Structure formats: structure tokens, C-alpha cells
Amino acid sequence: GKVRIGFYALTSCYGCQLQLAMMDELLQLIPNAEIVCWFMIDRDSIEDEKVDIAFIEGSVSTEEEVELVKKIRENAKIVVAVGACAVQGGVQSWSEKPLEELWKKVYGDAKVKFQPKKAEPVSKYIKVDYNIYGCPPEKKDFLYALGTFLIGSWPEDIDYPVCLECRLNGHPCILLEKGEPCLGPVTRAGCNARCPGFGVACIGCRGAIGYDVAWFDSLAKVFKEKGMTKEEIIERMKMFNGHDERVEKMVEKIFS
């Protein structure tokens, strides 16, 4: 009896798997366990093994991926959504463009035996029990859930914005001082504020959090003297959170 972990895959850049892959003592890092299905790494992998942990990565973009996510919800006591493509539908959700106008704008009228669908989180069809965030997640975010899950416990989610860690590091607001639209005050954290800390704006990759605490003195004031309109913030929050229905009124608290 060694805890069963499979790593299954949907529609992705496999960065979230790449991330687990390039962690180097990884098998010293999950010993009370066994890897049963990770096709990128094991050819001895089978999909219809009953597993204990189910790291599902990617969007549901083809119909048979509706068959897979239901398939794995059944052979798994825990289905963990890994990365923004599986947590949020990703960057393939930031257009509401119907599938067919997207088929025509790329394929014209040329049929593929396989059924494509608009992008959707894993949550739509099957129950997600936990969420590892980031595009891709941080090594420290994979260390946490695997190790905690494997001593028997349950993981939890950092509910504070990127701006807290941002400030910790001594990082100067590239928002206040430089006019870049940072999605840092509305993005869950964990990245050690990587993008402020490169003179770059937070682009949202770790997911939407809500702005229910007054971290900035007046973000509306900053957004009304940088020239950042509520619609702007929305197009940008939508690049990794285009299925959040909460966006439209979260940015509206900020300007109210």
C-alpha cells in the first residue's frame, strides 16, 4: 500500500507537469506514495487505475475530456485542480467567442474527427476538492499540497493578494511609480511577487482574489490618475479569470 497519485492531462502547455517534472529529488519528496499514471513520464501508465490523488491539469476543450474528468472523478478519492487551465479555464477563456467562430477563424470549414468545445474549468462537470494555483504554479505550491496531503492532512489556499509579498521584499509599486496596470491588488499570491519585482505588472496568473481590505490608500484614485477604466481592469482580469462571474462587481467595489 503506497498512496496512488496519477497526473492526468487535458488541454495545456504541460507547464504544470513540467513543473513537477523539473523538481529533481521529486521521488525523495513523495515516498509514502507511488506514481501510477503520468504519461509524460511513465509508459507503464493506465488511466483506469483507481488512485488516491488526481492531479488534473488543463481545460476541458475536447468532448472526450468530458469523458476523462468524469472517468477520474470515479477512480479517485481526491481530484486536485492544477493550474489556471484547470482551475480557471486559463488563457483559452478570455474570449467569449463561440467555438464555431473560433473554428472558422482558424480552420475555415474543415472537419476534424474529434469534437472541440469552448474552454471550461475542471469544476464545471466534476467536483474539485482542492486548487493549486499559478500559471504555472510555484514549486513551493506543489511541495505544500503533496506533502500535506500525504501525511494525511488537507491543504489550504493563500487568500491574500500578491501585494503583501510584493511589499515585504521592499519592492517599489511599479503601479504607483510607473503606470503599469498591476493586477496585484486583485490576484491571489504565492509567487514571491515575481512580476513587480522585475519592473513588470502582475498579469493575474495565480487567480482572482477579491479586494475586501484597503491595501491601497485609494486604488480608484490611482486608477483614475493612471487612466485605468473599470472595463480595462476587466479585459485584463479576464486573461486568466474569464470564467469568474465575480469580476464585474469586484472591480466595481474598487471604483465605488
Binding site: 492531462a9 487535458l10 488541454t11 495545456s12 502547455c13 504541460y14 507547464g15 507537469q17 513540467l18 513543473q19 517534472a21 523539473m22 529533481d24 521529486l26 521521488l27 506514481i35 504519461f39 509524460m40 513520464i41 511513465d42 509508459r43 507503464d44 501508465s45 481545460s59 476543450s61 475536447t62 472526450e64 486559463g90 488563457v91 483559452q92 478570455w94 474570449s95 467567442k97 467562430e101 473560433l102 477563424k105 482558424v106 480552420y107 475555415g108 474543415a110 472537419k111 476534424v112 474527427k113 474529434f114 472541440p116 468545445k117 474552454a119 500559471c135 504555472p136 515575481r194 512580476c195 519585482g197 522585475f198 519592473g199 513588470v200 498579469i203 496568473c205 479585459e235 485584463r236 486573461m239
Partner: protein, 420 residues
């Protein structure tokens, strides 16, 4: 009506399969079915502002984020008329070389070698071949580290921006790098001599058409303005449509491609066959002593050409960090007037040629055309599997299903790239 279906190919990037059709004559058709959902990176970005569409192209594929993103870059910058500052390209070439060093070393060591050693998983020869895998992660993590220094990351680099970089590092780091590169060249040296002793199978030898960007200066490189083909032809990188054409088939979400109405192969042998003489350093001598192994006549010589290039690209970024360091201190980025225009770039991605073609009108993206290297390759891939399927079909199926795949895994297919 009694097929060989390999529902999934192991140790490649992406969701795909095979349907090898057996008849009574032998082998009818070979079908690589590719099921990785389109993500319509060519359309969802349309009507979106350039910067915003640009931080999104690298999420096509984690084995080649730098490539996509640094290519997106060059084509948005021919579009808006910008030109890179000189030490700022050298750094972009450097960042591309840690995408390259790592990709190969991850494909070769953790995807290819397991088949020639007996192992299903690379997570397995861990206490049986310890030194290789310690050689493995050393090359890979000079890779992984380089990208984490000049691009915030290995998967999707947010520091490389329009105009250059958002924070270049302290000088000492480009020196320590050059110090870690010099402590790597013996590691790729080992990897040459390992993958050359390996089998480039006979059931695949046969004539192939080999296409490659042509290096825009004196040396083997990545960037350049002229696609070359192995016949002895050359054509402007801006007319890739007017010289290569796409077509949809029902058996894949990825298009297929012809040069001269027939299959061709991009992806590192293609570069050695086409631009071998532009090399120097330990790599020139390794090609000029091991060439009956680096012929355009066998798929699997893709694997050993990778090993050779880790020799080249290690040494060239040594010189290229040196070139950058002669303009120090360097301003990170310069300002880019986003004016309207069109731009095509062709670069050598880890696997062959990546074309980005960008149109922007009024700050936003009105058009885009991407073709990635695995998509270019899908169609000679299928023929080279057929060729193996020919000489092995009435075998124990599981004796067959291993060797076709190795062939697949000899292109380093990257299916999240062939479907975008």
C-alpha cells in the same frame, strides 16, 4: 478492421496517438491522431492589444516559452518598426539557449534514453545509471537557471518585454553564468559520446527534405531572414506561405505541411544538414569526426544533433554574454512606439522553425499566423512510422508499438505546439 492503436504516446509533450492501418498487402496508412484541444491562440488574441496578446503566446507550450515569446517579440517589432539594441539581442539569444539546452537535455535524457536502456520511466534508472541523470539535471538546470535569471522563469517569461527586458541582472551574474557554462561543456561532451553509440535504425533510412532558418550573420544561430531547404534552395522568410502550404485532415487538430507538395523535416538535423559550416568550437570538430551519424537520411540522427548543439550553444552564449558585457552598464528596455504594421519572424525553436506573423492596427492585433515545428513535422513523422510499420507489422504487437514510438520520440514532437 484490426488496427494498431497506441491511444497515447509516452514521453512526448501532448495528447496524441497512432492508428496504423494493417491490410492484407502489409501497411496501408499510418495515422497520428492528435487530440489536444485547439486553444485557438490565433483567434482569441484577435482584437486584443499587442502587449496583452504577447504575454499569452508562451502558454501554447512549456518546452518552448522563450521561443514563442522571444519570437512573438521579433515579429511585433518588425511590425511597429523598432530594431533591437545590439547587446539586447545577444541576451535574447542567450535566454533562447537555456530554452534550447534544457529542452534537448530533457527530451534526450528523460524521453529518449529510457527506450534504449530498458525503462518505462526516467524516474527509474535513478539508482542504476546515477551519473547520467546527475549529468542530466546539470545540463537541464543551467537551462532552467538561465531562464530564471533573464526571464523570471522557465515556463512563460514575463521579464522579456517589448523593447528588451524589465530588469537585467547584476554583472556578476552574467560572469557566474559564463562560469557555469564553462562548467557544463564537459557535460554535453559526455552526452555527445553517449547518444552516438546508440541505434539509428535501418528501417527508417531514406531520403528526406530538410528546412531551416538561415543564420543572419557569421554563425550557426536561431534568428535569420531566409529559410533554406536541403535541395540547395533558399527563400525569403517573409514568403513562407508563398513557399509552404497547410492542410487540415480529419485525423488531427494540427494542420500538416508540404514543401514542394511533399513531406519535410525541421528540427536540428535539418539545421546541421543545412547550416553545418557556420559552426566553431568543440562542435565543428565533433561534426567533422562523427558525420556518418549526422546524415539527413535517418530520423534518429535528430537525437545526436541535439547533443552536438548543446556543445555549440553552450560555447556561443559564452561569447554572447561576453559581447553583451562590452556594452555595460545596459539600460534594460527602450521605448517602443506602437505604430501600425506587419511583421514576420522565423527563428530556430528547439525543434525546428517557428513562424510568427503579426498584424496590429490601432494598438491591437488584427491578424496572426503561427506554424510551430512539430506541426511542420507531423507528416514526415507519419511516413517514417509507416516505414517502421512496414518492416515489423506482423510482429508481436507490443514489439511493434515500442519502435514506432521511439520514431515519434525522435522528432521531439511537442503537440501543444502543433495545436495552438
Amino acid at each position: 478492421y484490426l488496427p494498431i492503436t497506441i491511444d497515447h504516446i509516452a514521453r512526448v509533450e501532448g495528447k496524441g496517438g497512432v492508428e496504423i492501418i494493417i491490410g492484407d498487402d502489409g501497411v496501408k496508412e499510418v495515422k497520428l491522431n492528435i487530440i489536444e484541444g485547439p486553444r485557438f491562440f490565433e483567434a482569441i488574441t484577435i482584437g486584443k492589444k499587442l502587449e496583452e496578446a504577447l504575454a499569452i503566446y508562451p502558454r501554447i507550450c512549456s518546452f518552448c516559452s522563450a521561443a514563442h515569446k522571444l519570437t512573438a517579440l521579433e515579429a511585433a517589432e518588425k511590425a511597429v518598426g523598432f530594431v533591437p539594441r545590439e547587446e539586447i539581442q545577444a541576451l535574447r539569444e542567450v535566454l533562447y539557449i537555456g530554452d534550447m539546452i534544457e529542452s534537448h537535455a530533457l527530451h534526450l535524457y528523460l524521453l529518449v534514453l529510457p527506450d534504449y536502456r530498458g525503462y518505462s520511466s526516467p524516474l527509474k534508472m535513478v539508482n542504476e545509471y546515477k551519473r547520467e541523470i546527475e549529468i542530466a539535471l546539470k545540463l537541464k538546470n543551467l537551462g532552467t537557471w538561465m531562464m530564471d535569471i533573464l526571464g523570471s522563469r522557465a515556463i512563460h517569461q514575463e521579464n522579456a518585454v517589448l523593447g528588451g527586458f524589465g530588469k537585467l541582472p547584476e554583472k556578476s551574474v552574467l560572469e557566474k553564468m559564463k562560469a557555469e557554462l564553462r562548467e557544463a561543456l564537459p557535460l554535453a561532451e559526455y552526452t555527445f559520446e553517449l547518444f552516438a553509440k546508440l541505434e539509428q535504425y535501418s528501417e527508417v533510412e531514406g531520403p528526406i527534405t530538410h528546412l531551416a532558418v538561415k543564420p543572419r550573420g557569421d554563425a550557426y544561430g536561431i534568428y535569420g531572414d531566409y529559410i533554406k531547404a536541403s535541395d540547395g534552395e533558399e527563400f525569403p522568410s517573409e514568403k513562407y506561405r508563398d513557399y509552404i502550404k497547410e492542410f487540415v485532415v480529419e485525423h488531427s487538430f494540427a494542420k500538416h505541411s508540404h514543401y514542394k507538395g511533399r513531406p519535410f523535416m525541421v528540427g536540428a538535423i535539418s539545421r546541421v544538414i543545412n547550416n553545418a559550416d557556420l559552426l566553431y568550437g568543440k562542435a565543428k570538430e565533433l561534426y567533422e569526426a562523427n558525420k556518418d551519424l549526422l546524415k539527413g537520411t535517418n530520423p534518429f540522427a535528430n537525437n545526436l544533433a541535439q547533443a552536438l548543439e548543446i556543445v555549440y550553444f553552450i560555447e556561443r552564449a559564452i561569447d554572447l554574454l561576453d559581447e553583451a558585457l562590452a556594452k555595460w552598464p545596459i539600460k534594460p528596455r527602450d521605448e517602443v512606439e506602437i505604430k501600425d504594421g506587419f511583421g514576420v519572424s522565423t527563428t530556430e525553436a528547439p525543434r525546428g522553425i517557428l513562424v510568427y506573423a503579426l498584424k496590429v492596427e490601432n494598438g491591437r492585433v488584427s491578424y496572426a499566423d503561427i506554424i510551430t515545428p512539430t506541426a511542420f513535422n507531423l507528416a514526415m513523422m507519419e511516413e517514417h512510422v509507416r516505414m517502421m510499420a512496414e518492416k515489423h507489422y506482423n510482429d508481436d504487437p507490443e514489439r511493434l508499438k515500442i519502435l514506432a514510438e521511439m520514431v515519434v520520440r525522435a522528432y521531439d514532437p511537442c503537440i501543444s505546439c502543433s495545436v495552438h
